[PDB]
From a paper:
First, we used SECMALS to analyze the oligomeric state of the protein and found that the majority of Cad1 forms a hexameric (403 kDa ± 0.451%) species in solution, with a small amount of the dimeric (139 kDa ± 1.1%) species and of a higher molecular weight (5–31 MDa) megadalton fraction (peaks “H, ” “D, ” and “M, ” respectively). To understand the organization of the protein at the atomic level, we solved the cryoelectron microscopy (cryo-EM) structure of hexameric apo-Cad1 at 3.6 Å resolution. Consistent with the SECMALS data, the structure displayed a trimeric arrangement of Cad1 dimers forming a homohexamer. The dimeric deaminase domains form the core of the hexamer by arranging themselves with 3-fold symmetry and are linked to the CARF head domains through a 51-amino-acid linker (L1, inset). Further, we observed that the dimeric CARF head groups are tilted to one side with respect to a vertical axis from the center of 3-fold symmetry (black dotted arrows). The tilting of the CARF domain around the L1 linker brings it close to the deaminase domain on one side and distant from the deaminase domain at the opposite side (labeled as “closed” and “open, ” red arrows). On the other hand, mutation of W349, which interacts with its counterpart in another Cad1 dimer via π-π stacking of aromatic rings (inset), led to the detection of a stable dimeric complex by SECMALS.
In order to identify novel CARF effectors, we used Foldseek18 to search for proteins with structural homology to CARF domain of the Cam1 effector. This method rendered a 600-residue protein containing an N-terminal CARF domain followed by a linker region and a C-terminal adenosine deaminase (ADA) domain, with accession number HAJ98955.1 from an unknown Bacteriodales bacterium (hereafter named CRISPR-associated deaminase, CRISPR-associated adenosine deaminase 1 [Cad1]), for which homologs were already identified in a previous bioinformatic screen. cad1 is located immediately downstream the cas10-csm genes of a type III-A CRISPR locus. Further analysis of cad1 homologs showed that over 70% associate in genomes containing type III systems (mostly belonging to the A and B subtypes) and exist within many unique phyla of bacteria. These data suggest that Cad1 is a widespread effector in type III CRISPR-Cas systems. Altogether, these data demonstrate that Cad1 deaminates ATP molecules to ITP through the formation of an hexameric complex that requires a Mg+2 or Mn+2 cofactor and an activating cA4 or cA6 ligand. While the triggering of a growth arrest in the host is a common strategy of all CARF effectors, we believe that Cad1 introduces a new mode of defense for CRISPR-Cas systems that couples nucleotide deamination activity to a sequence-specific, RNA-guided adaptive immune response.
Residue numbers in the entry:
A (entry chain B): 1 to 251, 300 to 502, 515 to 600
B (entry chain A): 361 to 600
C (entry chain A): 121 to 192, 200 to 240
D (entry chain E): 361 to 480
The structure:
Amino acid sequence: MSRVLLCSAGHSSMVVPEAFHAVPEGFEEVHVFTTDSEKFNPVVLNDFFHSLPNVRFSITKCHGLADILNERDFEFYQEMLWQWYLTKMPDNELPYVCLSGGIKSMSASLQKAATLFGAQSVFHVLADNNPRNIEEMFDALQKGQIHFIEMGYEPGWAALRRLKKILPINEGCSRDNFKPLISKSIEEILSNVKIMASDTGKSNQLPFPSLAILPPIAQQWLQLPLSANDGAWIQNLPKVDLHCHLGGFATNGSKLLKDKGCLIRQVELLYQSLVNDNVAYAEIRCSPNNYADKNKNRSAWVVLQDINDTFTRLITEAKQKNQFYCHVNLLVIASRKFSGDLSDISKHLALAITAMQQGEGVCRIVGVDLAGFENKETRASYYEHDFKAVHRCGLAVTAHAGENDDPEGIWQAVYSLHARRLGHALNLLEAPDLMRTVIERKIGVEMCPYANYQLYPLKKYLEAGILVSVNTDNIGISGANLSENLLILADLCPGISRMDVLTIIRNSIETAFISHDFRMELLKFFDRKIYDVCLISIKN
Amino acid sequence: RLITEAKQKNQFYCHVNLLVIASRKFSGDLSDISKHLALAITAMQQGEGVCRIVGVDLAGFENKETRASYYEHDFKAVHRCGLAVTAHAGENDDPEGIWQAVYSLHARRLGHALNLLEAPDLMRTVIERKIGVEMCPYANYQIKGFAPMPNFSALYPLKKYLEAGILVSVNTDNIGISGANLSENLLILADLCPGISRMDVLTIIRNSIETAFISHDFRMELLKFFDRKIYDVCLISIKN
Amino acid sequence: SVFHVLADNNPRNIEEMFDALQKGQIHFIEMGYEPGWAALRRLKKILPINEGCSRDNFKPLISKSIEEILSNTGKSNQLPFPSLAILPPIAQQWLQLPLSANDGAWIQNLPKV
Amino acid sequence: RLITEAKQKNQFYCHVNLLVIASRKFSGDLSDISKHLALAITAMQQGEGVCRIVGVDLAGFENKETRASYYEHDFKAVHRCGLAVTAHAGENDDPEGIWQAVYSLHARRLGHALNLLEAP
Ligand SMILES: [Mg+2]
Ligand SMILES: [Mg+2]
């Protein structure tokens, strides 16, 4: 924990040691902002802090401004002071600051910086004798002449404290080619507040994925239909992939992947690809029975356990280094056979229940998949009594009735299997009753853009209000990742905009089978990341 | 007519929809249940209107004689039409009853369900399915007893129901009998559930908005109006 | 509007800074328009003029809220009504305060369902 | 390991197989029954080995309130996969519960059933 101290000193440099000694508990880092004037005496605080190496210290100089004389000088000083304050923020803490030093102008500017970004406690210092050398200030504080004065305790604006990611690519804000981007931030916040308070029609709401603090230009840009040149922006956007088959990545499967080494390499390469695509969460459907080998003592349970263990090891390694990581859970696919050994479905269900019973592990089992040939021969009116068992133990179920299926099949897949999530079902338009059912019950749709590619009802699905989630199915077989999956909607569904992409991501994140706590943590991280990425992208 | 005349003057109007109560063993023969649900679905098929019927209700006295696992076969068709069900599975109802109500009847809402805290799997599934739980603070407080009743130890489970993530909704039940409208029904929680914050009250309002059986577009309009009004109220809330 | 006035010579007499403003020596420095909070002035109604008062009757009405701004994850991302973000932070932390009995006026003014 | 060690020295060894008892748990978060059935199914599916799980047993709270005429629908999967069924009932139960147990769960063994003599 770091008690970073920020201050500004004018003709007097004594004030910073007084601020340090005002709280006997002792700070950890101290930084002072000063102009390039010659009246400064850095040596006294320099050797005073050299008396205690254990406390970090730094000095930053505002070049080119001897003193504030006109409007340009003051605006330059304010921009540099804001930049220095925001570049010296703690990563996850509010700092302290003393306003005593400097003339009224920089004191007011520093307090404005505090009011914009927030601080743990702002304070002042009062010296009865106004000491100038260390021994006499020490004697004054020993006697009791030291006086520290405090008013402030403010949280600040999280959103405007959150824009430090844009400081690079400025060379150091040279006056010849300086752009006061902090002034852009302040005009942004004032513009949003004034527009909100000076109108009602615009003041309705708009952004459900939660944000509403971007500049109005940024919101207008979001409202425009997306183009094919937004590839960098969407790639920078974090995504969720709720339908991705493990065995269709390096296209493989039953004939090749029986050995352990191939499974390990497939797992690691899939995780690397997912992290490369900035995907923050995904659900994976895997076939343990298709991957087992009774000859080599390789049971389906063993295969699933090994998958879970390697996934857990990988995510733990990624998290321990404090780098972006992709949380992933497995889905046991109840492969459709309907020809022989029909007990395989029950075996898969029991395996899934026992797998979720593991309990421990950040990576676990959350749902089962009723995939396979979705024809009438294997509709949802066959095994509901057996699915009573999996539903008893509180396990989610994902169905798939989207290819060559009639509305009643979707209907009692919804109402007998009770699929909390639904796959595909592109022809849902022609069943308004089924529209009303799916919308009212808030069950999502696992529509895969490239899979059907190899008029798209996606836009109409968003208009109706279906919680549609864009999914990649098999990136290896399709040859395109999730980023291309959202990219192709530009010409697949004309008139589509970036706000709809954000709503798609939001629908995906609520649609995943996750605990309430993990869901809300994922929402927090996703909101943070989308805010940062749009702030970065709007400027460039 | 009331809604139309209130809106024509561009004032604050409370949009209202109905609920058809299908009581169990309340008047004699149980064919009254089918009469009620047929009436409800036929009223729904009116088509055009402003104040509509959204669904049906299933209410009973205590249990057993008024259990929620008796009329699934009757409920098949009325559910199939497109209505919604709010089973009164609660108030000293055994967990199997609520499980049947949520899963066999596909009921989107529960009445009271005060003792859900002792059925962890029932919690888990309800939270995972975002099934609303209507609950009346003053009514349940009077008829059951929760801290600070004298000579009582049980405390209200609202704060737990919120932090777990249940889509709880605060209601009034019987205004005249309880002698409390929605305002004091929300206010009573301060001494009923200590440590409750205003932010959780806002989330409760949001959940009540979410759990209504209403169309999507009406939901967007309702959310926009509520958010603007809530921002305005909180702007002139800190004044006092 | 809150601003600042700076004088190079810091005049003392009327003719001096009159001449300074004739030349334009006195510059004007402001950090921009400050909306404040749209509604906080009912404190001046509930608290009378109190012309007869001393140090005994201090009002720490807001300072306790200021202290409980951050002194106190669940309450951080539970935000509904996304326009609630634009709400000034002081009122946000006020919402973060626990509920009380005396909020009946706001409860009545609260649009409910 | 015990039976392998006993057999390696060519001594007398007692071959042992398991029975996963599906405890009644009158209410007791009754999903434990399905949990036990799934655990037994996957344990049998493990397969390789000399000591093996061979069947399931249901017992506990023998009173008529927890008879065998409730869970007749769950036992379809455990019977289809290939496991064996045992039902303990008859110490103080009616002479009809045995009929359901033998003819609904297809139980190959009957616990106790001391009062069978009065049901020819
Ligand atoms: Mg697929
Ligand atoms: Mg009632």
